[PDB]
Design a protein around this nucleic acid. Structure first.
Lengths: 197, 49, 27, 127, 156, 93, 106
RNA sequence: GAAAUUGUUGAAAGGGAAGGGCAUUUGAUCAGA
RNA sequence: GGAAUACUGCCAGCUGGGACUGAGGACUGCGACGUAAGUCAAGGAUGCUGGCAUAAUGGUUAUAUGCCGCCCGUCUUGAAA
RNA sequence: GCCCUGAAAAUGGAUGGCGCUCAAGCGUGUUACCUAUACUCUACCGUCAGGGUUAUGCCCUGACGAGUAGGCAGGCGUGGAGGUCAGUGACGAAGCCUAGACCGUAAGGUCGGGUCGAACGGCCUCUAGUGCAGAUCUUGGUGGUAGUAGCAAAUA
RNA sequence: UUGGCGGAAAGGCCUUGGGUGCUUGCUGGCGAAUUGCAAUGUCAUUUGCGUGGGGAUAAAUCAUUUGUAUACGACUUAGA
């Protein structure tokens, strides 16, 4: 119901998010994923590291430069999981993937914007408690991603700025709600209450 | 990775480095860092910024 | 800004990017 | 002008081309049945050219009719034209290719006098 | 001879049509359409403009006035299937719709007959519109679908 | 598109191509190389189309072409036009 | 005032298709806010328009239109089948479409 | 004075083939009434 | 002790929306509604209205897009090989 | 009952892939839904049968349509011959080119434009040295390979 | 127009003042018509030529040369 949808990857499952996103792009919705480093996978760390190693040992033998390119970042892991769903070898699939943008962390201009979630892809809702899960920043740093220490240092600044913003907005909202409560009990407000507002 | 966001040069430079910037030195007017030296004016607001 | 030519050059780059749709962050 | 007729529908407007007539110059577009037993076109595999068959045939009431609603009749002279004195709402004259311009004007004049439609006027008559 | 001749020739006698058993029968309009009902137009010059309903005509159409005074819509013929019928209503008493028929609108600037008829009807229409609060402004306004509006759920 | 996944490639290429082609079409229209509408006075719809007669009447009204006229055909056209105007005069009288 | 919309926004998803076969004569439309066939039964029979832009101006407009009708539902999620006078070109999978409120039964 | 084949001009397509079938968009071109 | 409802089934019960089709070409027939007169949804669609009247619809052609599509013939149980 | 093990090598690799963990897995049950040249209804083409009617034709009705070796039937086309159109034609015959038009399910036929400059067609029949993608086919011609290999023995 | 913040791809955020219009917060007065019963019915940068804003005055490549280089291209140097 929007021109563009920003999705916070925190607390989500890679494959389910990939499925819903792919079917949205193929329908024509523009989507932007952020905080891929906080993304989650089902199963313990060991299993998924073993899986990535199984993927990593695969390579064209007579020339390694033309084989499966093993991208280490969480954004690229998610992009792989997604591209395997889309028929990316078609113009339709290319145009679909060109409606997508994946980012580690929340950079500008999306930091000053609203983010959403997908409840049929969240870990806490889809998984049963008492089940091991894996996080993608840890996995990528294990398999050779050399940037997890900068993204944390930057998110620690973004969060402070956002907290200042929220502390301002929350006092403004208190003022507004108090003024509205004082305006209430007027006959205009009674009519609005009757009509459902 | 690492990104360069600014580079600052000196006021006066030598014909040697100017030659490095140039590829046909004997024909040019040698206009390399004229406007930068001009940007090195009274207080150097840009330089200090 | 840096106030001399970076302003014009950067706004022109961004508008070329937004007309050709060749921008990494913006659509 | 012509008679009322049912609406014309054809069932196949596209031409029936021979297999590999696009691939070879020696193989012409005239239709020829593939007699091969290993032939996917004869075996009617999915994703192949269509073959002519009587199911594609046109309706008898609209057969041999041009969009004007007339059946074409070739004409070389005023005598062949006067065969169609009655049948103006069913038939339409078409002057033969071998006819000359001094006789074409005669044929057109008589066709105008008799109230006959000519299919190919302006032939050798641009002057 | 170039093309010899056919021995057979079809006769050029064109035959009459069979007696068709398809008689015109009057229209059965939906329940929501009743005179004095406020209507929303979905197409035309005046798409999205709220008007009133006055009369059903011989050619299946509906006669409507804006009124012209408030929203700028004249006496007009409108199809019933390009219209939404609100539950809002006005009482029609005294307006002379008897004059207007299908021949009134045949066309073959504006006619003094037309402006005369329009004024004399919309004085009597405004007189009853003034009873309800805000109906003048409601009819002056235009209709539009906002974000989050679903016509299958919307009561009109 | 793997080295830059967040940059559109094909949509930009197709934007470029469609604008490419639209400009060329508009200029081929401005240069009068495309044929006019069916009802325009200079149109040739229903008539016969022959570059020989076109060149004949152009050189009677009297920057590189493959269109010539064959003086043979020019003499033939003059002959047949004399016949045509003879018939028109016999209608005359 | 700010909005003059008298249509509903929808998306052209696909043609009617099997696994490996498609019927271009029938198209599939997803309507905004419609989640069930019980709701799409409202929108059946409605008129559909795909509006696109060309460079040429043909009859006083650079804007061209393809008209069609909604015919029936498709599945359980509120998707509908549609038929146009001329079938859509398949470069429009993921393109917006206008579903008008006429012909109205209200 | 055909075809294979070739040159110039004009239009178009082209991310490790091309060609073909169904359907339509876009551009060009065209007949009938 | 008194009812109701569910389930199953029936109605030659009522009503509404949506899609595709309109074959045939004077009459003849079974029927129905009607005091008759005649009328009718009864042996295949009629009626009202607007716009354009031309490249607009449509065809042909060069491309693009979605899906499909292995190079022909012969030989043999059977091959893209 | 489910789970682990219950042995299997060597280019990198496949529940079809992505990926899935109160499943997008196993078992079972209840509904809704997708979808074939299959089933139903309608139109059209053809065949077959049955009827009707002063015309190997016209009309009504209905059921059917896979196909190799192979069989039967109806048709299209080429060279020459008898007849006929008192046919066509230097105001342009045949032939050739053609993003142009039309008719037939098709074989094929017809038209327009351009080139060409002297003979050629429809119909009732006859006749045959009568229709090609192949045959490591015949003759002739032409290409990519390719401005490439190379034009380096014998002293200059 | 004041002042401040913001470097992850900041290119945006907030703020001061004075102008300039509008205000459907409330009540009035005029106009709409024939787009003819619907036809999406079109509403959201400049490159190019009037525009006269209208002044300021760089390089690379070939050729030549060098050999820290080299099959040829390339590379590396020099030359008013």
């Amino acid at each position: 119901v929007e021109p563009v949808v920003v999705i916070d990857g925190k607390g989500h499952l890679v494959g389910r998010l990939a499925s819903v996103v792919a079917k949205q792009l193929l329908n024509g919705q523009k989507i932007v994923v952020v905080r891929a480093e906080e993304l989650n996978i089902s199963g313990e760390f060991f299993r998924n590291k073993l899986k990535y190693h199984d993927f990593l040992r695969k390579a064209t033998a007579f020339n390694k430069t033309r084989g499966p390119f093993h991208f280490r970042a969480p954004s690229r892991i998610f992009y792989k999981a997604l591209r395997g769903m889309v028929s990316h070898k078609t113009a339709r699939g290319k145009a679909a993937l060109e409606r997508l943008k994946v980012f580690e962390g929340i950079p500008p201009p999306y930091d000053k914007k609203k983010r959403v979630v997908v409840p049929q892809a969240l870990r806490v809702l889809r998984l049963k408690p008492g089940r091991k899960y894996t996080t993608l920043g840890k996995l990528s740093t294990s398999v050779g991603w050399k940037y997890e220490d900068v993204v944390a240092k930057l998110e620690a600044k973004r969060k402070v700025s956002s907290a200042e913003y929220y502390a301002k907005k929350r006092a403004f909202t208190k003022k507004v709600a108090s003024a509205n409560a004082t305006a209430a009990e007027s006959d205009v407000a009674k009519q609005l209450a009757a009509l459902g507002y | 990775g690492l990104r360069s966001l600014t580079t600052v040069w000196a006021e006066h430079l030598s014909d040697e480095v100017k030659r490095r910037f140039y590829k046909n030195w004997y024909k040019s007017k040698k206009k390399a860092f004229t406007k930068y030296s001009a940007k090195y004016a009274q207080d150097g607001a840009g330089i200090e910024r | 800004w840096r106030d001399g030519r970076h302003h014009t050059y950067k706004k022109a780059k961004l508008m070329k990017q937004s007309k050709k749709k060749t921008s990494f962050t913006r659509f | 002008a012509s008679l009322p007729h049912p609406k014309i529908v054809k069932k196949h407007t596209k031409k029936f081309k021979r297999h590999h007539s696009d691939r070879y110059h020696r193989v012409a577009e005239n239709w020829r049945k593939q007699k091969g037993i290993d032939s996917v076109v004869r075996r009617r595999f999915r994703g192949n050219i269509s073959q002519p068959k009587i199911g594609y045939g046109s309706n008898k009431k609209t057969k041999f009719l041009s969009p004007s609603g007339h059946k074409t009749f070739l004409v070389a002279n005023v005598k062949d034209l006067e065969t169609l004195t009655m049948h103006t709402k069913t038939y339409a004259a078409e002057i033969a290719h071998n006819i000359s311009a001094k006789n074409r004007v005669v044929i057109l004049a008589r066709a105008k006098a008799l109230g006959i439609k000519v299919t190919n006027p302006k032939g050798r008559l641009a002057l | 001879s170039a093309q010899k001749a056919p021995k057979w020739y079809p006769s050029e006698d064109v035959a009459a049509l069979k007696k068709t058993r398809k008689a015109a029968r009057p229209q059965k309009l939906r329940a929501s359409l009743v005179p004095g009902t406020v209507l929303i137009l979905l197409a035309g010059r005046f798409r999205g403009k709220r008007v009133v309903y006055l009369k059903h005509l011989e050619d299946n159409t509906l006669l409507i006035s804006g009124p012209f005074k408030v929203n700028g819509v004249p006496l007009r013929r409108v199809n019933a299937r390009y219209v939404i019928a609100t539950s809002t209503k006005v009482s029609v008493e005294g307006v002379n719709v008897e004059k207007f028929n299908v021949e009134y609108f045949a066309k073959e600037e504006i006619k003094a007959e037309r402006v005369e008829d329009q004024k004399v009807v919309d004085k009597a229409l405004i007189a009853e519109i003034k009873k309800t609060p805000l109906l003048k402004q409601y009819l002056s306004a235009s209709f539009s679908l906002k974000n989050g509006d679903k016509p299958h759920m919307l009561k009109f | 598109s793997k080295n830059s996944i967040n940059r559109p490639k094909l949509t930009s290429n197709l934007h470029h191509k469609v604008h490419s082609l639209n400009k060329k079409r508009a200029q081929r229209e401005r240069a009068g190389l495309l044929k006019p509408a069916r009802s325009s006075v200079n149109s040739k719809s229903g008539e016969i189309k022959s570059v020989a007669l076109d060149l004949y009447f152009q050189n009677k009204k009297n920057s590189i072409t493959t269109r010539t006229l064959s003086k043979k055909r020019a003499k033939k056209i003059e002959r047949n036009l004399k016949y045509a105007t003879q018939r028109k005069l016999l209608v005359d009288a | 005032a700010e909005s003059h919309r008298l249509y509903v926004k929808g998306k052209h998803l696909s043609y009617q298709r099997s696994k490996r076969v498609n019927n271009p004569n029938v198209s599939l439309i997803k309507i905004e806010g419609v989640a069930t066939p019980q709701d799409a039964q409202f929108y059946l029979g409605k008129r559909i328009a795909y509006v696109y832009r060309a460079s040429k101006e043909v009859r006083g407009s650079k804007i061209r239109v393809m008209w069609g009708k909604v015919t029936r539902t498709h599945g359980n999620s509120g998707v509908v089948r549609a038929t146009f006078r001329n079938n859509l070109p398949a470069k429009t999978f993921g393109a917006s479409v206008r579903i008008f409120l006429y012909p109205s039964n209200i």
